[PDB]
């Protein structure tokens, strides 16, 4: 049970690091979503004008 606790202590930190790496991708996807759409919004404003 001690070895099981030990080998499970290295898996939780692995998933924590994986979450943090995917957490860094959150900024990427939100910055690519807020961008590449205001230009198109100005384009549709030009369309309605």
């Amino acid at each position: 049970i001690d070895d099981q606790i030990q080998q499970l202590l290295l898996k939780q930190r692995h998933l924590l690091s994986k979450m943090a790496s995917s957490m860094k991708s959150l900024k990427n996807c939100q910055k690519e979503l807020i961008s590449t759409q205001i230009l198109q919004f100005e384009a549709q404003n030009m369309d309605v004008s």
Partner: protein, 265 residues
Amino acid sequence: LNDNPIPKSVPLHPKSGKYFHNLHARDLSNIYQQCYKQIDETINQLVDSTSPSTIGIEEQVADITSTYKLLSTYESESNSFDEHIKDLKKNFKQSSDACPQIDLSTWDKYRTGELTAPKLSELYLNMPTPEPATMVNNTDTLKILKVLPYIWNDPTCVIPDLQNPADEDDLQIEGGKIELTCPITCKPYEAPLISRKCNHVFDRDGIQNYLQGYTTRDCPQAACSQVVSMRDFVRDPIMELRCKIAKMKESQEQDKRSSQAIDVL
């Protein structure tokens, strides 16, 4: 230039202004605060699941605090980014508030070339980065870290200059001389409390037995003549963290002693 039949610049229309006001940024605040809360609670369950038999805690606290500071910098720069986006949209709305009317003469003037209505394109491609300063270090989650190192030697000691924020690692943790028991109850406390003005740790039950009975009661310790109220006390999780870590170490050493007694018998 005549590359595009539509003019390179165009004023704003109320029909377009409706949708322009309809613009909104994604709710990053709630997801960021909930991921911050899950990060701090997983840090708590990490520091709870630790054991003195595990050697090599320095590298793990180093990498978790590096991840913590990285996510804090990311959250702060995202906050600065959305603030700058709000400022940019306010600039766009105030520049379009002075836009001319819509007719054929204005269309012709803007088609032949008239830098009068600046679009959001050029202001967004080369938008100035906010470069936020004054790193957020007042968060209790930033106070949670660094309490795990330098505790396996003497948990019941606190150096007086530990509250010095001069060091970059959230504190200056060193060995000193402090009491682990509450003098009012004469028993090792499990629910500690300490205020910023008194700077004295006390048991919650003891401090509530000593506080009730008088509307203005000073602290039992000396060197603080000012009165301390209920609102002055703050919940410092570092103290209870240290007490429960010491309790875990005591249970671990008792288990080790029992196992050794098993071996010798």
